[PDB]
Amino acid sequence: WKEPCRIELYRVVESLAKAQETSGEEISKFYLPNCNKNGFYHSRQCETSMDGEAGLCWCVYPWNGKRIPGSPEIRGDPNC
């Protein structure tokens, strides 16, 4: 795909919506792909949070959204 992140984002949103229907817990954080406007991945990827706590962030290759080996994972901007 020319816009891999955008396609993934749609798929993830649909699956999350579906999972929430039968979810046995109330999730306050989840991972939505962080896409740039070209439909690739921002270097920094973070969990989405709605609970007043920082989500985990890590660093990816923008062309595929896969974590860079050795990347830090912290609740804050890793400065990717």
Swiss-Prot record:
GO terms for cellular component: endoplasmic reticulum lumen; extracellular region; extracellular space; Golgi apparatus. The modification Phosphothreonine is found at residue 22. GO terms for molecular function: insulin-like growth factor binding; insulin-like growth factor I binding; insulin-like growth factor II binding; signaling receptor binding. Its main location: secreted. Residues 2-80 form the Thyroglobulin type-1 domain. A motif (Cell attachment site) lies at residues 75-77. Phosphorylated; probably by casein kinase II. Phosphorylation alters the affinity of the protein for IGFs. In amniotic fluid, the unmodified protein is the most abundant form, while mono-, bi-, tri- and tetraphosphorylated forms are present in decreasing amounts. The phosphorylation state may influence the propensity to proteolysis. One of its GO terms (biological process) is positive regulation of cell growth. It is found in: Secreted. The modification Phosphoserine is found at residues 23, 28, 71. Binds equally well IGF1 and IGF2. Interacts with integrin ITGA5:ITGB1. Interacts with VHL; this interaction inhibits HIF1A degradation. This is Insulin-like growth factor-binding protein 1. The chain holds residues 172 to 251 of 259 of the full protein.
